[PDB]
Design a protein around this nucleic acid. Structure first.
Ligand code: MG
Ligand code: MG
Ligand code: MG
Ligand code: MG
Ligand code: MG
Ligand code: MG
Ligand code: MG
Ligand code: MG
Ligand code: MG
Ligand code: MG
Ligand code: MG
Ligand code: MG
Ligand code: MG
Ligand code: MG
Ligand code: MG
Ligand code: MG
Ligand code: MG
Ligand code: MG
Ligand code: MG
Ligand code: MG
Ligand code: MG
Ligand code: MG
Ligand code: MG
Ligand code: MG
Ligand code: MG
Ligand code: MG
Ligand code: MG
Ligand code: MG
Ligand code: MG
Ligand code: MG
Ligand code: MG
Ligand code: MG
Ligand code: MG
Ligand code: MG
Ligand code: MG
Ligand code: MG
Ligand code: MG
Ligand code: MG
Ligand code: MG
Ligand code: MG
Ligand code: MG
Ligand code: MG
Ligand code: MG
Ligand code: MG
Ligand code: MG
Ligand code: MG
Ligand code: MG
Ligand code: MG
Ligand code: MG
Ligand code: MG
Ligand code: MG
Ligand code: MG
Ligand code: MG
Ligand code: MG
Ligand code: MG
Ligand code: MG
Ligand code: MG
Ligand code: MG
Ligand code: MG
Ligand code: MG
Ligand code: MG
Ligand code: MG
Ligand code: MG
Ligand code: MG
Ligand code: MG
Ligand code: MG
Ligand code: MG
Ligand code: MG
Lengths: 130, 252
RNA sequence: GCGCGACCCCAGGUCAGGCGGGACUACCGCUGAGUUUAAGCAUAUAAAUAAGCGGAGGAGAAGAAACUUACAAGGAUUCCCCUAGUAACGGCGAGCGAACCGGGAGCAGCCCAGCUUGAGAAUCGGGCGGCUGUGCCGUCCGAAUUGUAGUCUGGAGAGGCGUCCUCAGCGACGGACCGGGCCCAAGUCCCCUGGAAAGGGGCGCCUGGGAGGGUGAGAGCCCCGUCCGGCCCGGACCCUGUCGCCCCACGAGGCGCCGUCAACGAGUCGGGUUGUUUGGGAAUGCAGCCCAAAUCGGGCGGUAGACUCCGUCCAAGGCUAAAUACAGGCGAGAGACCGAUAGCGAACAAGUACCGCGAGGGAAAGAUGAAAAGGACUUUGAAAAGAGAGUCAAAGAGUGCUUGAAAUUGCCGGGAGGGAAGCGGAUGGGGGCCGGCGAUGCGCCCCGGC
RNA sequence: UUGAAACACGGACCAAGGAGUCUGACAUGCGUGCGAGUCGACGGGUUCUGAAACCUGGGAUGCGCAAGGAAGCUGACGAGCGGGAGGCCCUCACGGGCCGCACCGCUGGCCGACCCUGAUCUUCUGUGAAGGGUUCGAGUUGGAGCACGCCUGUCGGGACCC
RNA sequence: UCGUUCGUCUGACUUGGGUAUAGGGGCGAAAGACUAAUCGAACCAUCUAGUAGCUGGUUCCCUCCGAAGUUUCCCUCAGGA
RNA sequence: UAGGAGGGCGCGGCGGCCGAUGCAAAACCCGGGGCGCGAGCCCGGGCGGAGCGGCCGUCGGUGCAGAUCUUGGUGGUAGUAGCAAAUAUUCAAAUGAGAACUUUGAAGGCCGAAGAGGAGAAAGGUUCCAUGUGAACGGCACUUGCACAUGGGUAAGCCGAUCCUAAGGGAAGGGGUAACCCCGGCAGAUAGCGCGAUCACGCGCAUCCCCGAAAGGGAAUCGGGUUAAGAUUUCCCGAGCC
RNA sequence: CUAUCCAGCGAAACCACAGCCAAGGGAACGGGCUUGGCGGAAUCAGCGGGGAAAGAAGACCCUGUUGAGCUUGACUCUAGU
RNA sequence: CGACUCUCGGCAACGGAUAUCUCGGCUCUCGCAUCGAUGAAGAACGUAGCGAAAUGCGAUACCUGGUGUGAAUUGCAGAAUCCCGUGAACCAUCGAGUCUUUGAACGCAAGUUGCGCCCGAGGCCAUCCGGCCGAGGGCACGCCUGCCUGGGCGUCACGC
């Protein structure tokens, strides 16, 4: 249990530090767990989601629906993926927000820096597996 | 405890002064000026919205109390003496129905383990994993205003493993278990040995600790103990079996 | 018709520099009340405080005895404990009140002026130039003999002597403290309710990680983290750890011998008187005024005084960490604290709207939902809106929208009323309501199987 | 308020807020620890959830164990009676005897103030065998206290609220 | 403040602006008048939650016991020991 | 009664124990059924849609009908008192869903020029002008507005300020003050030096700084046009002046 | 011109609960008690007997071991001179 | 029967209590020492494609530069090569920059954007190879060390 005497263990301060996060902190808060085969591939559990990732929802009323990420919208703590839409009363289509911890990244947008990121995370996990 | 008290200057950051008699209103200090709803509203009272409280708490209450050092020692000895009873350990709520013998002792090879998988493996041999399970399945969110002051979760209490050999590693193994505590035997703590003020925390001794209890506490002998100025309290009856008193030949 | 040197003093938008103001927690200095207590009040107390006026730092102030003690004596400053609500002081009334001793925290001593280069200002600054750049060097100007430097500070010291003993720097790699970043165990497996599973049931796993937060409901295992630490970067470093090259002296210090020197701070101490202050009492400090020093000498030993002896220290110049404080500033952590009439006045565009000429005074105001999915369209309407319709689990959750009390009001049904109504004790008549409101079982006995 | 339905004052109604608390010293009562001791309270060591806990020092810190005096100073030389709980002995028992705590009452001794007193001894102003006292002490001839907690009371603090 | 009625109106007259005096102070052909609806001592903030022997309030139930207006002293009689 | 003590009920936490909870928690409502002498407690029904109890120990900002109690809300009062000075309005038309209140026209009256007219100083701050308008406001009403929204608008060598001084204010040197602050004629190499001259130097230095008036003193402007709103003299044409 | 009625609009003071009286008692002058009288929905406009009507913690008076303004031959001081 | 008054019960209002919360407060504890003439605190005015306030920032004006991170901002609209990279971002962070009028505030003032003096990059014509418009920059007060220019029979010497 907590031993570092510089990290907070208070509800008030944790909620503050969470809801008042900048963009660079919300990036890392906006992580999802890689799917099964993709975890076997990269030996990492979770990764901050991107613009052009293909996710598959798992817990909303939209389970088992797959789609590319089209909008990661850090201000409402939501994402919008392709076609995951509902219809307004007047008939327009609007995306519904899926919280990033309630999806899995089915396909991963391997940018060069995402490649280096997965290298560092995987070696970190394997230095404690070994 | 940490001292709590309202700020000294509360209720007195307004410069209100009473209207006195002759204004068809009460004589209580009232806020001056105009332009806001505030004008005419009473201040400085305990009775008024926006005043002090009666006898505002102050930091110099008696948060800590003192007890005679010998009375702490008496209390901790009578905390130990009550655990060696299965009936009071049960009445205090612990699940002891497969535990082999009281007061329960394990070998010192327990001291060498490292992981909590090993710790649960150890508690399977003893009869106390039922108690650890009670502690773990009782965990819940603390009802009331406690669930928002950084005290979300409560639980029950489990076996207090007592070791004697300093620097070993079970202290870090039994930690993650809810309800389960670890205490060195040199410094037994009353908050562990009798939670809630109730007698009989279910204690699990290792052999190393158990064989140095008597070198710590001593006997009915002056200077027996490791603790200066203390001999074990003697009771007001050597044998409190009213059965044999009221039913022995001499009385009857 | 002179040229001069010094002294004092000018003006310089001269070269280069230093000062003012701000915040208030804590710290230093001056100034300085009264309400209150005294059951009135006038000294006293409130109080050597609040207010006022100034000065700094991260702490400030204090600080190496002109001290206490009367002991077998101790040995700078500061704070905690006890001394001690004691000695004292006080219309000896209300009241007020320290110190030495002892126990702890921490501990550290120093440097000037004087008699002391006179074969010789050996000292310092500024300009200019060079470099190895917090400096050092070369040269010019200047300050300074009304004394810069050097030795010395009372524990001494200056000398003379002495076998003797002690002296310098620069690299290198780190260690330590500081900040920052990156990473780091384990189910989102099957069934049900549900808008949603974070809930129930089954089967599993992590745990040096069951602190905490997030996520559509009680989430160890979905996410961030937490435990263990790992990796990289950057600072200050001048604390110490080990290695290398350079080897420390006739100068200084120490130790010992000597006896001759042996300088120590002036309108300062001290005294009188006056005001304040104090626990300080024939006067504790401080201040004004007047008196006004000493060198076989000066200050103290808590009763003024003369004398004899004793103990004690050496002022009138300066610096000095730690131990201590901290309602302010920046960064943090917790809480048997308040939960929107509470807690700051302010959870919110709060010292905000607003008031006053001005000093200043100073509020009310938090929550739809999981997601705005915020009510398309038809119809009536001048429009606001209504009635259908739609969204959602729900809208009767409908933009001040979680739940929605009471006083108060409307409609619907009932009850009763000759200048009050309400209340208590009787039942009577109306309603509304209760099946644990009220039972059907016990033994003997005959089968027919159980 | 001696007397309220009062031609005595407050009160239109509802909701929420609203008034003997906290601290230092003391006191009695009670509980607990130890008990001629008791306190570990300021510090130190330890403490792997800890502002907690545990250990340590005191051979003199506070209170107590010794009081009287204003001060110099001196400082308890060992208790009897009456009544009494309860225990024990005698009697067949009624009744008697003995030991008799606490407590109440009584009478004394011892220490100190003040007075009184003087054999002896000594450093010549000290000691004090003997004997004292219509006086005095918050004494002694009973060791009972230290620490924490709580209620009531007192007092100072805003101090029950306005 | 309004209405009719009134005093004075070349005068020690009426008035704008600038300026002077700011609290035990100012100014006063004098009424203790005026000094921002405040004046026999303004307003503001602070000491300050000033003090009161005086008035008002002082919040839940049952149980049991349950009085005093009297002595004595006090600048003491609305109070206290 | 005053007052005292004992046993209990209730509120909010803390250390323990026992559990309830989306098959519906808390809270709140009821002509529901009970338990207790009583504080209160238990259950049912309903709304409500997420947390909550009971017991032992322990604690505290714990129990309301009053305080001309504080804050907030709501009644009767009550559709009541009342909307009354400044002479006054009327008829057609038009727009508009709707006309006493708007606009036009005809009429009738009032201010009667020390005016209820035309301009300013102060003070206000965009109220000025246009287009439109669901609410609110305009103490009745509105198509309307000084209300609300969106835009527009203020032109100077000649008008001012600026310049000068008055009452009077601030100040350098100096004197006081513990310091903030207070004194300005106290006379000090006075704050400023000035004037001819530089192709430089000579002469003088009085009574010696700054501020202070949009009513005092004052370099200079008139006429005719013009915009939804600017100007008389700010723009435009002409004619001048310093 | 109001007041009155109408359309529009629309407050506040005050209010324990309310509102018929005679006599008695009572805190010595009752709307409520006791004894009698009597007593019939609902409303309209007034009026000024009562509600010891409202306004204001009486200013007169007294108590205060509360103050304040002012005076003097009060007590104690102080600037000035 | 009906109206009124009182009332009981159901629903609807009025109203914002109660319950559940909480990026807030309060209290305690801890770590460091860092404002200003090199212009501070405070005040003012500006500043966004569509902003008034709050929050930033200063005519480079909700920012520029660096560095780190590594794909957004987001109420809407728009340029987006901004994509295996000299690289998005109301991102983090800090070294390079800018920092209007003010303010101790400093030329003199101040209900004034009032009124002065000095220097001067550049350019015009030549009343000369000088004058005019300048962009920028200066001018406070007391003081310290030095220097320059001076005054006084204050003390002197040496001289006409
Ligand atoms: Mg009234
Ligand atoms: Mg408050
Ligand atoms: Mg008094
Ligand atoms: Mg008094
Ligand atoms: Mg008095
Ligand atoms: Mg004093
Ligand atoms: Mg002060
Ligand atoms: Mg110092
Ligand atoms: Mg004592
Ligand atoms: Mg599940
Ligand atoms: Mg959670
Ligand atoms: Mg994880
Ligand atoms: Mg992780
Ligand atoms: Mg003084
Ligand atoms: Mg004196
Ligand atoms: Mg004196
Ligand atoms: Mg010093
Ligand atoms: Mg509030
Ligand atoms: Mg519903
Ligand atoms: Mg809802
Ligand atoms: Mg909800
Ligand atoms: Mg609601
Ligand atoms: Mg109701
Ligand atoms: Mg009816
Ligand atoms: Mg009845
Ligand atoms: Mg009945
Ligand atoms: Mg009477
Ligand atoms: Mg009467
Ligand atoms: Mg009366
Ligand atoms: Mg009264
Ligand atoms: Mg009343
Ligand atoms: Mg209440
Ligand atoms: Mg002792
Ligand atoms: Mg006896
Ligand atoms: Mg006796
Ligand atoms: Mg008290
Ligand atoms: Mg008149
Ligand atoms: Mg005039
Ligand atoms: Mg005039
Ligand atoms: Mg007046
Ligand atoms: Mg009070
Ligand atoms: Mg008061
Ligand atoms: Mg009494
Ligand atoms: Mg209370
Ligand atoms: Mg509380
Ligand atoms: Mg009430
Ligand atoms: Mg009417
Ligand atoms: Mg009228
Ligand atoms: Mg005229
Ligand atoms: Mg006019
Ligand atoms: Mg109207
Ligand atoms: Mg107009
Ligand atoms: Mg002028
Ligand atoms: Mg003029
Ligand atoms: Mg003029
Ligand atoms: Mg009407
Ligand atoms: Mg009558
Ligand atoms: Mg009556
Ligand atoms: Mg009638
Ligand atoms: Mg009538
Ligand atoms: Mg009338
Ligand atoms: Mg009448
Ligand atoms: Mg009356
Ligand atoms: Mg009345
Ligand atoms: Mg009265
Ligand atoms: Mg009296
Ligand atoms: Mg008088
Ligand atoms: Mg006299």
């Amino acid at each position: 249990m907590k031993r570092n005497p510089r990290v907070t263990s208070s509800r008030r301060k944790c909620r503050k530090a969470h809801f008042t996060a900048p963009s660079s902190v919300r990036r890392v808060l906006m992580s999802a767990a890689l799917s099964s085969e993709l975890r076997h591939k990269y030996n990492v559990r979770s990764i901050p989601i991107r613009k052009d990732d293909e996710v598959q929802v798992v817990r909303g009323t939209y389970k088992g629906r797959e789609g590319k990420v089209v909008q990661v919208y850090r201000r409402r703590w939501v994402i919008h993926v392709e076609r995951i839409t509902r219809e307004k009363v007047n008939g327009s289509t609007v995306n519904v927000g899926i919280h990033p911890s309630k999806v899995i990244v089915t396909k991963l947008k391997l940018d060069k820096d995402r490649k280096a990121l997965l290298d560092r995370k995987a070696r970190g996990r394997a230095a404690d597996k070994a | 405890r940490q001292p709590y008290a309202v700020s000294r200057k509360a209720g007195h950051q307004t410069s209100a002064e009473s209207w006195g008699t002759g204004r068809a209103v009460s004589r209580i200090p009232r806020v001056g000026g105009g332009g806001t709803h505030r004008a005419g509203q009473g201040a400085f009272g305990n009775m008024c919205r926006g005043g002090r409280m009666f006898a505002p708490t102050r930091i110099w209450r008696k948060w800590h109390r003192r007890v005679n050092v010998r009375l702490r020692r008496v209390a901790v000895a009578s905390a130990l003496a009550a655990t060696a009873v299965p009936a009071i350990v049960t009445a205090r709520g612990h699940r002891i129905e497969s535990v082999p013998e009281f007061p329960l002792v394990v070998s010192d090879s327990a001291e060498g383990i490292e992981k909590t998988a090993q710790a649960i493996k150890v508690l399977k041999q003893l009869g106390a994993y039922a108690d650890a399970e009670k502690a773990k399945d009782s965990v819940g969110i603390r009802p009331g205003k406690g669930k928002m002051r950084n005290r979300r979760y409560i639980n029950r209490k489990g076996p207090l493993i007592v070791y004697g050999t300093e620097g070993s590693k079970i202290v870090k193994a039994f930690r993650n278990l809810p309800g389960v505590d670890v205490a060195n035997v040199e410094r037994l703590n009353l908050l562990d040995l009798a939670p809630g003020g109730h007698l009989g925390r279910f204690v699990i001794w290792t052999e190393s600790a158990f064989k140095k209890l008597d070198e710590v506490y001593g006997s009915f002998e002056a200077s027996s103990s490791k603790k200066k100025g203390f001999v074990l309290p003697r009771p007001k009856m050597t044998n409190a079996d009213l059965g044999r008193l009221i039913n022995s030949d001499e009385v009857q």
